Design a protein around this ligand. Structure first.
Ligand SMILES: CCCCCCCCCCCCCCCCCC(=O)OC[C@H](COP(=O)([O-])OCC(O)COP(=O)([O-])OC[C@@H](COC(=O)CCCCCCCCCCCCCCCCC)OC(=O)CCCCCCCCCCCCCCCCC)OC(=O)CCCCCCCCCCCCCCCCC
Ligand SMILES: CCCCCCCCCCCCCCCCCC(=O)OC[C@H](COP(=O)([O-])OCC[N+](C)(C)C)OC(=O)CCCCCCCCCCCCCCCCC
Ligand SMILES: CCCCCCCCCCCCCCCCCC(=O)OC[C@H](COP(=O)(O)OCCN)OC(=O)CCCCCCCCCCCCCCCCC
Ligand SMILES: CCCCCCCCCCCCCCCCCC(=O)OC[C@H](COP(=O)(O)OCCN)OC(=O)CCCCCCCCCCCCCCCCC
Ligand SMILES: CCCCCCCCCCCCCCCCCC(=O)OC[C@H](COP(=O)(O)OCCN)OC(=O)CCCCCCCCCCCCCCCCC
Ligand SMILES: *P(=O)(O)OCC(C)(C)[C@H](O)C(=O)NCCC(=O)NCCSC(=O)CCCCCCCCCCCCC
Ligand SMILES: CCCCCCCCCCCCO[C@@H]1O[C@H](CO)[C@@H](O[C@H]2O[C@H](CO)[C@@H](O)[C@H](O)[C@H]2O)[C@H](O)[C@H]1O
Ligand SMILES: CCCCCCCCCCCCO[C@@H]1O[C@H](CO)[C@@H](O[C@H]2O[C@H](CO)[C@@H](O)[C@H](O)[C@H]2O)[C@H](O)[C@H]1O
Ligand code: SF4
Ligand code: SF4
Ligand code: SF4
Lengths: 185, 378, 49, 66, 122, 153, 60, 39, 332
């Protein structure tokens, strides 16, 4: 219970003090009992809080702080041209910790390598952000949007038509968060 | 008498119950707002402009809720039981005086009336806990009853010490007797014991661990019964407000405002019939108070039956509210006490001190020729 | 989790799995999602397996 | 809030606007207009408030939503 | 039964006379308990159906001729007995041991070749 | 028609103003539900008071991974909620299984056990997100016709 | 660059138990106070009940 | 003691008459209120 | 598999993923850079403060003191802003990874932690104003849940459950890991082995963790926060988009993963709830052959019968809170 070698210098406790060896005057000792002085001090600390500013935020008018690295709902982005950035490498499908991504790809009419299916089970996803660390083209991101509770969980099966619609909606904020964090990525 | 008694009976009863009920509703909002300032948050501030409707929506929600309590083998008990628990809560307000004699019932045995209505509280904690089906929780309703009866002895034995000083069980006489001095000053330790006894009597935290442990042993098969009922909540809040008014009646002034009109008499000595009202003081001058406009009006309003009654009730209200704060502050300041430890506090600390003071107080009143007369004076 | 049996143990009962659970999940022949699933049956008024 | 703060903001926004805020935000708050959303929402800023309260929104719709 | 009401310290059968003695005592306790299992778990079956179904679960392992295999089969029984006699198993686990409260019922394998062929392997 | 509508609005105002949730803090999402009671986001200011008993409650918030061993007690507690009843599923684990979806011990969604009215996404949702879900539910109740449905039939 | 400390290092923060004794809660000043309050009250009560008894002689 | 002065604690301060009032009616004048600084 | 460790003790996330990283790094035979060593020891103590704010204040909320809980959850609310700045999660960071940390800390964070540091002791002191000398608090924890030093060892107790019975022992001092051998801190050891000792030992760790965080701020060295080897840690995005070798190493790390050499290791750290350890068998491949988590609370709850025997039920609720118990830890 103590380490090997010599016992620690004064590890052993002093002998216990008898009641009449204690250094506390009866006046101090009896007063603290009947006046309940330590409980009075704690009640006074609550008066101090009473007259301090509160911590509360009025939501939804005032929001809490979120960093550029925040991990909210997924979005599929484009280039300035308008083409989808996604080229169907499937890296985000391989690294998914919860197997939430299902991708089916083929050759587009023009010969380009593009996805035909892009589904994200929002009820399987753990919001780790791994999908967006593995992208070679910044195609999949997680927007700062955390406010999308829905009614049915069928609404939480995002298909490629919803994830592109999300990127079109959120692009300025997505481009801004990428601009802030890119040096660190 | 100028008009019919039944009308007079009705107006005084409505004038006490409707303000008392509206007040019992705002103590619930107030206890959530006060605990939030001390906990650096906000209380209710959304149901109503300043959260002033929070009590209303809480009460109407419960009223509209389904109730699934057992109606079998006991139909009256499920329905007519808690209803009279709420009657036994409001029946104590009928002896509160809002000025000399200004009570629904001016009762000579007013104190023994509020000792009777209090011993009926034990039934509203015993019987409700009889509905819940869980072995350990039922024993927790007996332990809460045991706490109430023990802390009732604390209150009745310490009310005794006030009666010795006043000579009467009339709440009006008890307050009028404090015109000499508030009983907090000479019976300091009796007041503290009474306030501590009054928290334990209401089953309030930090003395609520017995009824607290029911929620922790409910299990996976049964549940409580105080569910959709606002009765045992209005019975609870109204007993806290009532224990604050009675605490003020006995130890603070009651409705006694420390009158500054005595101070101005002592200081002022340059009475002038021309209305100047010069004062013989160091910050004094020759005031220009308007005799035709102000002094004639001010003097009349001071002697009005409405104004003087108003100050007597604002005094009692300000004093009850200060004590309502001290109950809310106590709940937010301490952890809970175990049932055996509260029992030791009552039986081996508090009551020994009280019985020691029951000997000493009449002994001093005899030694200084200060036994009051027990005839109707004051 | 494995089915190994400890002679001398007082009260060697399951600690992690459900009450009528059959199988030892950390065995490598045991499948990841198991063999059974549960749901609430409206017609039977209980959870069924 | 506190009386000094709520008094000063009445001297700024007026009693008709004071009641508008009690109905929605539940606070008396004054700040500079920063801009308008396409949805019609209005944004205000005040470096002098409590932290995380320097920016707020006045929504355009009665049945507002984040 | 020191830590729990029906706990039995894990023991290793010394020989077949001992191992058969334990099996019979296990079967005896189970079929004794069947009325107590049928009220607690509100089993909508006769006590006779419960007892005949308990018998089947011992009838499965009647041909085990390994002594190391019997002890694990005995420990499994003792543990099942403990979690049923203490109200630890839910009615859902208990009346799911009866393999007719499936909405497909007891008939869940195909009866013969042709009926399973016309239904696509059941 | 107006009169029955008023009866609804008042009834809905009180189902909204007093919002008492019974809770099943199964795992981490409960921590984030505890941060909804702390000073930065306080539930009390909006009238939310978490009650222990199902009898005193309005809404169940399943917050955490539901396991096969825990599911009978989820259904028992929901079966004890007096009407009207609402359920919020909070987090990926309760919504659809989440990280433990492909496991032998986890129910893949709490709606295989009970009916759900709002699903809040995230592992864990932020405290704002769970607030957003409560406002969606509070809006669902404001659109609940009680005495105006009885009138059409 | 990276997120680095200031050149001279950050200053020391307060981390030890502070908890400083105040006279408001020490027993001796409170015992003395409660005593003077009860003595003043007992002088005021002994004067009042004497006057009350004299008012009763006049009433009778 | 173990305390360091409030003036080095990176929290909002009370000013003027309210500072004098606070440094009178408070257990530890060197204690902060935990409110961070906006700038 | 690293995000699985955030969800074990869900109030102490970055120290759960620290013990998994340290185990994998030991089989990888790699030395992680000094900056990540200090980042990990700083955020391991920010984590220890976060857990103790949950554990101490929830314990007192069960005992019936309700106000310290709310005060320190603003302190908790402020310290989760630092989690969400380094990562984007208020709870499950996934920040600590084999080979260091996922991303470098942002460029104004070490100033913001120092600003929080200047006032955090005052928060402990006011939390301590309410509980330490309070007689109701004292009379609900003295003599409750008393374990002898010999039995705490025989019962597999670690941490303050071990340390509150008078055994001086901290994994940080006895098997130093990360930058703990570079920081000066003390170890609170109790006397009477009861809940009051374990409360007083936990409050002292508040002040000791703050004392480490300040030292970490002043020794923060420069350099990679990630092991400088792309066969193990992901290359920068800019490299992957510019250099051939980097895209190959990026691609294979996110699909196959890195191979860990064969062998097994048992690795323990001083987690906030006791000793947390993992046994990892490696098969030389890219997936773990066997991961076993040793959870401090699992051993603590196993000794609840031996410790609560003869006590009252109101006593047992106090014993539940003095044992730092999150059931996602206990059941893995
Ligand atoms: C011992 C008792 C006190 C212990 C707690 C510690 C008190 C403390 O630290 O005080 C310093 C503290 C300094 O705080 P601050 O952040 O500098 O406030 C500056 C603001 O300008 C202050 O803005 P403001 O508008 O709050 O201040 C002006 C004015 C505004 O209020 C009024 O004029 C009336 C308000 C009450 C009536 C309406 C309802 O408030 C007062 O002057 C106090 C009025 C309320 C006193 C009684 C409160 C209930 C008890 O002062 C107070 O907040 C109150 C002073 C102490 C009051 C004790 C009673
Ligand atoms: C005297 C003390 C109580 C005054 C109440 C005045 C009415 C009131 O609160 O107005 C706001 C109320 C409305 O309050 P509310 O509850 O709708 O406030 C909603 C605020 N948010 C959106 C943040 C939840 O105004 C009315 O509609 C008047 C109702 C009168 C009812 C009877 C009183
Ligand atoms: C505003 C301020 C008051 C607000 C409410 C305060 C409520 C205080 C309740 C405290 C109860 C504590 C308790 O249960 O007992 C503590 C104790 C008596 O028990 P004991 O076994 O002697 O313990 C010795 C060490 N405390 O010690 C005591 O409590 C005895 C102190 C005497 C009580 C007052 C008597 C008149 C002076
Ligand atoms: C309340 C706030 C106002 C009082 C304290 C204000 C203050 O700062 O007073 C100065 C001093 C504080 O304590 P001290 O440590 O001496 O301060 C050193 C400063 N250089 O103040 C003091 O030293 C004196 C503080 C007052 C002590 C006597 C109080 C008596 C109150 C009436 C009797 C109450 C007793 C009964 C209590 C019953 C409780 C159950
Ligand atoms: C002990 C509590 C003592 C309470 C105070 C008693 C007191 O002051 O008695 C004063 C009394 C004279 O009566 P009083 O109405 O004050 O004055 C009449 C006009 N001179 O005169 C007396 O009765 C004299 C009192 C002398 C004894 C005082 C207490 C001694 C023991 C302590
Ligand atoms: P007779 O001499 O003909 O037979 C005696 C035995 C059977 C011992 C044979 O002689 C024999 O040697 N057979 C091999 C040994 C053997 O039987 N091994 C296994 C014994 S343990 C066993 O069979 C356990 C069965 C399951 C126990 C639980 C049953 C009930 C569970 C469900 C109840 C209903 C729902 C709650
Ligand atoms: C108007 C007549 C009465 C009709 C019914 C009115 C509603 C009655 C119940 C509400 C009254 C206040 O009741 C009290 O509310 C607070 C929340 O503010 C609860 O407090 C709860 O949440 C707060 C939130 O910070 C926690 O600090 C506290 O630990 C917790 O218990 C109390 O557990 C409850 O007892
Ligand atoms: C000594 C003189 C006394 C004069 C004043 C006497 C007043 C007596 C009024 C009795 C009214 C009923 O008394 C009161 O009942 C309610 C409901 O049963 C109890 O309240 C009970 O239910 C509520 C919930 O609804 C709980 O929050 C509370 O903890 C519990 O104890 C109070 O604990 C009790 O004080
Ligand atoms: S989003 Fe990125 S990682 Fe996923 S398939 Fe498309 S290109 Fe590959
Ligand atoms: S954030 Fe969600 S979708 Fe992306 S990799 Fe992680 S679990 Fe899969
Ligand atoms: S959804 Fe995420 S945070 Fe919530 S319980 Fe599941 S793993 Fe924990």
């Amino acid at each position: 219970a103590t380490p090997a070698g010599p016992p620690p210098k004064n590890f052993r406790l002093p002998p216990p003090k008898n009641w009449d060896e204690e250094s506390e005057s009866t006046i101090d000792k009896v007063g603290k009992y009947f006046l309940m002085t330590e409980m009075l001090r704690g009640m006074y600390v609550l008066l101090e809080q009473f007259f301090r500013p509160p911590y509360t935020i009025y939501y939804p008018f005032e929001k809490g702080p979120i960093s550029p690295r925040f991990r909210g709902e997924h979005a599929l982005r484009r280039y300035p041209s308008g083409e989808e950035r996604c080229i169907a490498c499937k890296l985000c499908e391989a690294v998914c910790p919860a197997q939430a991504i299902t991708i089916e790809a083929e050759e587009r009419a023009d010969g380009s390598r593009r996805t035909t299916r892009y589904d994200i089970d929002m009820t399987k996803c753990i919001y780790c952000g791994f999908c967006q660390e593995s992208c070679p083209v910044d195609a999949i991101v997680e927007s700062p949007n955390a406010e999308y509770a829905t009614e049915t969980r069928e609404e939480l099966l995002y298909n490629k038509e919803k994830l592109l619609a999300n990127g079109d909606k959120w692009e300025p904020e997505l481009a801004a968060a990428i601009r802030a964090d890119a040096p660190y990525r | 008498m100028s008009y019919s008694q039944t009308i007079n009976s009705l107006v005084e009863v409505v004038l006490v119950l409707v303000p008392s009920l509206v007040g019992i509703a705002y103590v619930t909002v107030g206890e959530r707002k006060t605990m939030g300032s001390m906990q650096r948050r906000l209380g209710p501030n959304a149901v109503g402009i300043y959260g002033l409707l929070q009590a209303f929506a809480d009460a109407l929600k419960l009223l509209l809720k389904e109730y699934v309590g057992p109606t079998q083998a006991n139909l009256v008990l499920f329905f007519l039981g808690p209803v009279i628990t709420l009657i036994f809560s409001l029946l104590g307000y009928a002896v509160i005086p809002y000025g000399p004699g200004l009570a629904v019932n001016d009762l000579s045995t007013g104190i023994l009336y509020m000792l009777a209505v209090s011993s009926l509280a034990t039934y509203g904690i015993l019987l409700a806990g009889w509905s819940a089906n869980s072995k350990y929780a039922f024993l927790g309703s007996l332990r809460s009853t045991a706490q109430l009866i023990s802390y009732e002895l604390v209150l009745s034995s310490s009310i005794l010490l006030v009666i010795m000083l006043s000579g009467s069980l009339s709440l009006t006489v008890i307050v009028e007797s404090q015109r000499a001095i508030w009983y907090i000053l000479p019976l300091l330790p009796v007041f503290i014991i009474f306030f501590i006894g009054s928290v334990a009597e209401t089953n309030r935290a930090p003395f609520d661990l017995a009824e607290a442990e029911s929620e922790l042993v409910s299990g996976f098969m049964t549940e409580h019964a105080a569910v959709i009922f606002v009765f045992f909540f209005l019975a609870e809040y109204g007993s806290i407000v009532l224990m604050c008014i009675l605490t003020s009646i006995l130890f603070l002034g009651g409705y006694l405002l420390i009158s500054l009109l005595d101070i101005i008499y002592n200081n002022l000595l340059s009475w002038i019939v021309i209305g100047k009202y010069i004062i013989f003081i160091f910050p004094f001058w020759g005031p220009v108070f308007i005799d035709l406009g102000l002094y004639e009006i001010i003097s009349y309003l001071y002697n009005a039956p409405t104004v003087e009654g108003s100050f007597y009730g604002l005094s009692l209200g300000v004093k009850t509210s200060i004590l309502i704060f001290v109950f809310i502050w106590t709940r937010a300041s301490f952890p809970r006490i175990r049932f055996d430890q509260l029992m030791s506090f009552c039986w081996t600390v508090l009551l020994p001190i009280l019985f020691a003071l029951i000997v000493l107080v009449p002994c001093i009143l005899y030694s200084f020729n200060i036994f009051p007369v027990n005839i109707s004076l004051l | 989790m494995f089915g190994v049996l400890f002679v001398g143990h007082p009260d060697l009962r399951r600690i992690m799995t459900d009450y009528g659970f059959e199988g030892h999940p950390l065995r490598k022949d045991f499948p990841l999602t198991g063999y059974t699933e549960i749901r609430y049956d409206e017609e039977k008024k209980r959870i069924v397996v | 809030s506190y009386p000094t703060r709520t008094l000063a903001n009445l001297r700024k926004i007026g009693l008709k606007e004071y009641f508008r805020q009690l109905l929605y935000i539940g606070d008396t708050k004054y700040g500079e207009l920063v801009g308008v959303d396409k949805f019609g929402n209005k944004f205000y800023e005040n470096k002098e408030e409590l932290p995380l309260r320097t920016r707020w929104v006045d929504y355009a719709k009665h049945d507002y939503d984040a | 039964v020191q830590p729990t009401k029906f706990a039995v310290t894990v023991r290793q059968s010394r020989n077949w006379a001992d191992a058969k003695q334990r099996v019979i005592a296990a079967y005896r306790a189970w079929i004794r308990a069947a009325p107590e299992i049928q009220t607690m778990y509100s089993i909508p079956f006769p006590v006779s159906h419960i007892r005949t179904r308990i018998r089947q679960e011992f009838e499965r392992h009647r041909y085990v001729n390994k002594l190391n295999v019997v002890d694990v089969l005995l420990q499994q029984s003792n543990a099942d007995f403990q979690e049923t006699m203490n109200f630890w198993r839910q009615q859902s686990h208990v009346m799911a041991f009866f393999k007719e409260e499936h909405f497909r019922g007891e008939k869940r394998l195909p009866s013969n070749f042709i009926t399973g062929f016309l239904e696509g392997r059941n | 028609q107006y009169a029955l509508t008023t009866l609804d609005i008042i009834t809905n105002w009180a189902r909204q103003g007093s919002f008492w949730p019974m809770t099943f803090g199964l795992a981490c999402c409960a921590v984030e539900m505890m941060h909804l009671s702390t000073p930065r986001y306080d539930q009390d200011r909006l009238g939310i008071i978490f009650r222990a008993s199902p009898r005193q409650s309005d809404v169940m918030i399943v917050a955490g991974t539901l396991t096969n061993k825990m599911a009978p007690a989820l259904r028992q507690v929901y079966d004890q909620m007096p009407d009207p009843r609402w359920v919020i599923s909070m987090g990926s684990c309760a919504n659809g299984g989440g990280y433990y979806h492909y496991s032998y011990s986890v129910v893949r969604g709490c709606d295989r056990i009970v009916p759900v009215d709002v699903y809040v996404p995230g592992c864990p949702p932020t405290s704002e997100a769970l607030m957003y879900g409560i406002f969606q539910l509070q809006r669902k109740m404001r659109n609940t016709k009680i005495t105006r449905m009885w009138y059409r039939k | 660059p990276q997120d680095m400390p200031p050149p001279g290092g950050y200053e020391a923060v307060q981390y030890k138990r502070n908890l400083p004794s105040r006279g408001l809660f020490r027993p001796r000043p409170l015992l003395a106070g409660a005593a003077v309050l009860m003595l003043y009250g007992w002088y005021k009560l002994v004067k009042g009940i004497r006057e009350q008894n004299e008012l009763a002689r006049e009433k009778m | 003691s173990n305390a360091v002065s409030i003036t080095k604690k990176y929290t909002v301060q009370s000013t003027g008459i309210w500072e004098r009032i606070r440094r009178a009616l408070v257990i530890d004048p060197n204690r902060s209120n935990g409110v961070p600084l906006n700038p | 598999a690293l995000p699985y460790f955030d969800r074990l003790d869900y109030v102490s996330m970055m120290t759960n993923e620290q013990v998994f990283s340290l185990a994998v790094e030991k089989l990888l035979n790699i030395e992680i850079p000094p900056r990540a060593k200090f980042i990990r020891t700083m955020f391991g103590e920010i984590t220890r403060i976060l857990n103790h704010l949950m554990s101490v204040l929830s314990h007192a909320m069960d005992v019936g003191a309700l106000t310290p809980f709310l005060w320190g959850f603003e302190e908790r609310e402020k310290l989760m802003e630092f989690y969400e700045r380094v990562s984007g999660a208020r709870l499950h960071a996934a920040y600590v990874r084999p080979g260091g940390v996922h991303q470098d800390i942002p460029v104004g964070l070490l100033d913001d932690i120092y600003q929080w540091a200047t006032q955090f002791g005052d928060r402990i002191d006011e939390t301590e104003e309410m509980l330490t000398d309070n007689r109701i608090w004292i009379n609900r924890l003295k003599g409750v849940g008393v374990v002898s030093a010999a039995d705490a060892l025989n019962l597999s107790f670690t941490g303050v459950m071990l340390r509150g019975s008078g055994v001086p022992w901290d994994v940080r001092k006895s098997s130093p890991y990360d930058a703990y051998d570079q920081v000066e801190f003390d170890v609170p050891v109790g006397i009477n082995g009861d809940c009051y000792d374990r409360y007083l030992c936990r409050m002292e760790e508040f002040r000791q963790s703050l004392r480490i965080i300040h030292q970490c701020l002043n020794k923060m060295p420069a350099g990679p926060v990630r092991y400088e080897d792309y066969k193990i840690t992901p290359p920068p995005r800019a490299a992957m988009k510019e250099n051939m070798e980097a895209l190959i190493h990026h691609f294979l790390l996110f699909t196959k993963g890195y191979a860990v050499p064969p062998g097994d290791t048992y690795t323990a750290i001083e987690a906030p709830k006791g000793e947390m350890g993992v046994y990892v068998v490696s098969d030389g491949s890219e997936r773990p052959y066997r991961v076993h988590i040793r959870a401090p609370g699992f051993a603590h709850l196993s000794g609840f019968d031996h410790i609560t025997r003869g006590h009252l039920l109101a006593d047992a609720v106090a014993v539940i809170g003095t044992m730092d118990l999150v059931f996602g830890e206990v059941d893995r």
